[PDB]
């Protein structure tokens, strides 16, 4: 049903085959969905290092699954701003494979104690995407499952 309805941009599978997917049995088939920049879709793959892979969502090395990415600039892009979507720019250390962090605590930079107010040397970790219809294909919104 995937091919017939939704055209795809990067349809890739690791450890399994697309055509031979139907005639196989699994006990659990998960499904993780998010929205990533176009040029950062490639960070969703085994291993890899980057802003998204290391600090937001890290896939395991011995990964058995499929990654689906298709453009959404027609719908997901907003009229003049899509500041809703955010990614974790600042984190102390990398994520163990298949992990999640939703903390909005203010990051600490420097040995000086960090107060609640961001100010200087303390930053709000999450940073907002900028989505507008006139942006290039690199910075256009994408949907990855």
């Amino acid at each position, epitope marked *: 049903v995937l091919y017939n309805f939704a055209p795809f941009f990067a349809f890739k599978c690791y450890g399994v085959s697309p055509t031979k997917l139907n005639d196989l049995c699994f006990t659990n088939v998960y499904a993780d969905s998010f929205v990533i920049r176009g040029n950062e879709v*490639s960070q969703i793959a085994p291993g890899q290092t980057g802003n998204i892979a*290391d600090y937001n969502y890290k896939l395991p090395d011995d990964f058995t699954g499929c990654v689906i990415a298709w453009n959404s600039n027609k719908l997901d892009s907003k009229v003049g701003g899509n500041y809703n979507y955010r990614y974790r720019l600042f984190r102390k250390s990398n994520l163990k494979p298949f992990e999640r962090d939703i903390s909005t605590e203010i990051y600490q*930079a*420097g040995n000086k104690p960090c107060n609640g107010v961001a100010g200087v040397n303390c930053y709000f970790p999450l940073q907002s995407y900028g989505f507008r219809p*006139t942006y*290039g294909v690199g910075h256009q919104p994408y949907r990855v499952v």
Partner: antibody
């Protein structure tokens, strides 16, 4: 916060140098730190980057000969180079990234010439 | 890949008038761009970052506003100490990352 840099001088082609980035006020093991190059009378260029995690990305012109290192004991950032006559003829800068694009705390440059 | 270029290059501006600088980005651009000031023989310092955010210690004299491909910065006051050089940047994907583009020169 101050970022005083040491090292430099003149190194013959095919030689090696290391530069240390001393930072007092910010943690090197917690911020995006990077190296910026500026040949005399020309624009700036980017060399390395070093995330809070064990990650590092290099530019194409400085890949395979340039190695970066961090030591939390001295709270300093090190860059290791295996120089070439046109690869390293510039002042080197040490900076921190606030909002993922802007480098604010730029340290004083160190002259690294090859001859 | 995107290429950052600046149109003015060298300029001549007197104390009385103002100066407007523009740098273009190929294949579109996000809202993240930083402006630097580099007096000769000195390490450059951040002047304007993000979308006209302005920075502590940077005078309200400076103000750089723009959106999309067309980006620009303008100085309102009379420029007592004649500034020298200015640059753009924008962080990119894995291979290139920080792209500064050609510099700009302004003087008396």
């Amino acid at each position: 916060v101050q970022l005083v840099e040491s090292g430099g001088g003149l190194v013959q082609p095919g030689g090696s140098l290391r530069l240390s980035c001393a930072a007092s006020g910010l943690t090197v093991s917690s911020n995006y730190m990077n190296w910026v190059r500026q040949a005399p009378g020309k624009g700036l260029e980017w060399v390395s980057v070093f995330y809070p995690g064990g990650s590092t990305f290099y530019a194409d012109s400085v890949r395979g000969r340039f190695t970066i290192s961090r030591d939390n004991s001295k709270n300093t950032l090190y860059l290791q180079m295996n120089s070439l006559r046109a690869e390293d003829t510039a002042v080197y800068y040490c900076a921190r990234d606030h909002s993922g694009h802007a480098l604010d705390i730029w340290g004083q440059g160190t002259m690294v010439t090859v001859s | 890949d995107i290429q950052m270029t600046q149109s003015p290059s060298f300029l001549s501006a007197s104390v009385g008038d103002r100066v407007t600088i523009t740098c273009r980005a190929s294949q579109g651009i996000s809202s993240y761009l930083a402006w630097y000031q580099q007096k000769p023989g000195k390490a450059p310092k951040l002047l304007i970052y993000a979308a006209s955010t302005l920075q502590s210690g940077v005078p309200s004299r400076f103000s750089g506003s723009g959106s999309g491909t067309e980006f620009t910065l303008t100085i309102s006051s009379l420029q007592p100490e004649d500034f020298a050089t200015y640059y753009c940047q924008h962080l990119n994907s894995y291979p290139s990352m920080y792209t500064f583009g050609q510099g700009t020169k302004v003087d008396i």
